[PDB]
């Protein structure tokens, strides 16, 4: 209340003693646990633990990959956790050589089970999937354990390693050669409305545009073949009701001076990837555009 408390400098939230230290020193005991600097105290990476089977943990020992979850209508698994690299089979944008490569690495039961689950219902993928963020750790037993990051950066504990998000080259998509100073990165899923080939187009867009109207306005003009395909399937097959010709959502933002190239190695099967070093995660829900 008085002037000294508002005239005092703010208390250092780190240099003041911890709650365990001010509990110990007031009663003066000792324990075998070293206490005086708690880990993760100066953290803003909001983590979340995740359990996964062995079939979905390949290409994940190297940290940084999209842990996008799904749901099956069957009641025993209510959700499952697909990696972005495992979504490349249903990606129509993935080339046939790269698809034949990454089908030769996910040959466990869970991956192909998810692949069968993806293309079975009467829905598209945008009401089937749900994005979470990036994985940074792996316990790697038989049933592994993943710690995603919903919001914040991607760093190791004690801040000594800024982890990086990789995306495969067949999903990378930039739209201007003069890249901006700060740029954002969005998750585009488009749909070609062919009958048999309703497998969607997966894209990870990296643009300087942060607005939503001026992003979907320049997104209508870069998928006009698929837009006209939507109108074409609307007119040649009436009394069927499709929707959400494309869907975008905000994934995060990077610094645009370190988005580079690399290659993942997993059982000596290399794969050229676009690497984003100082990635941040700021999620947005699946919005759509026609």
């Amino acid at each position: 209340m008085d002037a000294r408390a508002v005239a005092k400098r703010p208390r250092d939230p780190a240099d003041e003693d911890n709650e365990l230290v001010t509990a110990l020193k007031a009663k003066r005991e000792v324990n075998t646990i070293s206490v005086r600097y708690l880990y993760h105290a100066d953290h803003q990476a909001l983590t979340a633990r995740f359990f996964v089977p062995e079939g979905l943990v390949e290409f994940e020992a190297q940290p940084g990959a999209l842990l996008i979850r799904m749901e099956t209508g069957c009641d025993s698994p209510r959700h499952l956790y697909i990696s972005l690299y495992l979504l490349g089979i249903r990606a129509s944008n993935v080339s046939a050589s790269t698809r034949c490569l990454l089908e030769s690495v996910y040959t466990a039961s869970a991956a192909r089970a998810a692949l069968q689950w993806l293309d079975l219902g009467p829905h598209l993928l945008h009401r089937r999937l749900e994005t979470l963020g990036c994985v940074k750790t792996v316990s790697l037993g038989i049933t592994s354990l993943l710690t995603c990051v919903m919001r914040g950066y991607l760093y190791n504990t004690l801040k000594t390693e800024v982890f990086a998000l990789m995306i495969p080259k067949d999903m990378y998509l930039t739209w201007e050669e003069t890249r901006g100073r700060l740029q954002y990165v969005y998750l585009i899923i488009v749909y070609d409305y062919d009958g048999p080939e309703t497998r969607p187009g997966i894209y990870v867009l990296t643009s300087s545009i942060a607005h939503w109207q001026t992003l979907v306005d320049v997104a209508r003009g870069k998928f006009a073949r698929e837009r006209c395909s939507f109108v074409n399937r609307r007119i040649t097959r009436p009394r069927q009701i499709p929707l959400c010709t494309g869907v975008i959502q905000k994934l995060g933002w990077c610094l645009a001076d370190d988005i580079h190239t690399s290659f993942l190695v997993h059982k000596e099967l290399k794969l050229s990837v676009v690497r984003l070093d100082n990635f941040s995660v700021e999620l947005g829900d699946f919005r759509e555009f026609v």
Binding site: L46, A48, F50, D75, H79, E130, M150, V231, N232
Partner: protein, 282 residues
């Protein structure tokens, strides 16, 4: 280092069992009409909003602009509300009728099915629900309001019986009917009238405007559009100005149902499924 805690006093004598009832509702959500500092309980929740002749949609339009506070602590003669900010993470109770999982996106809904009670006061808290069930409830309620006038027939009673229940994971739950005593509430009447008006104007003016635009057609897309409209289809300009402004005002009187902003996304739920940890989002 105290945080933003709205002091919510009461205006009534409570027993010790009343506080023992109220202390079970710690990590729950509460709607507040204004970001104030000191408040009674008459402006605490939704029972101040509940009208006899107004219904679900008019409650939801007065639910988009509420500070969704929590209840950090309860003590003698006062409650400590806790305003959340976008970015942090907080524990939210599973007070909704439907359970959640790990990774869902959660939003707010009025309580369709039926806590502290006084003589004029009943403490009521809003439903917190995942997004697909929210969209399912919206598209159920609008169509069930659309079957209001033709309710007299014998098939449509079975049709609204089918539409009355929803299905989530092990949640065979049903909703109350929007129509009471064979006439629609004015809330859902406006909600359905806006949809019927925008459909009836889209089926009337779009043909004229697309054939006006077809001379400046510089894409391979608008021609398929007007061909589609032509295949479906088998005055003074102030009327056109009035019709376009009527179209846009009936669109403006509709945006409470067309979307829902994501508020919470769960991160990990408690075992036995009574609370969860959620990062708040705007």
């Amino acid at each position: 280092a105290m945080e933003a805690n709205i002091f919510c006093t009461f205006d009534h004598k409570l027993s010790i069992a009343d506080v023992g009832k109220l202390t079970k509702l710690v990590a729950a959500v509460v709607p507040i009409p204004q970001r104030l500092h000191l408040i009674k309980h008459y402006q605490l929740g939704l029972h101040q909003f509940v009208d006899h002749t107004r219904g679900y949609v008019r409650l939801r339009g007065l639910l988009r602009n509420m500070t969704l506070t929590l209840m950090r602590r309860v003590e003698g003669n006062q409650i400590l509300l806790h305003v959340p900010t976008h970015g942090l993470l907080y524990t939210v109770l599973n007070t909704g009728p439907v359970t959640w999982e790990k990774g869902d996106a959660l939003c707010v809904l009025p309580p369709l099915f039926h806590l502290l009670t006084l003589g004029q006061w009943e403490l009521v808290l809003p439903w917190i629900v995942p997004m697909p069930l929210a969209l399912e409830i919206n598209q159920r309620l609008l169509i069930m309001g659309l079957f209001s006038l033709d309710r007299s027939y014998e098939e449509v009673k079975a049709a609204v019986q089918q539409l009355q229940t929803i299905t989530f994971r092990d949640a065979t739950f049903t909703i109350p009917d929007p129509v009471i005593d064979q006439h629609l509430l004015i809330d859902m009447k406006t909600a359905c009238l806006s949809m019927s008006m925008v459909a009836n104007l889209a089926s009337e003016l779009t043909m004229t405007y697309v054939r006006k635009l077809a001379l400046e057609d510089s894409s391979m897309l608008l021609v398929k559009c007007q061909e589609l409209l032509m295949r479906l289809d088998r005055v003074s300009p102030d009327d056109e100005i009035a019709r376009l402004s009527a179209l846009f005002v009936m669109l403006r009187q509709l945006d409470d149902l067309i979307r829902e902003q994501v508020v919470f996304t769960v991160c990990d739920v408690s075992p036995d499924n009574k609370s969860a940890t959620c990062i708040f989002k705007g």
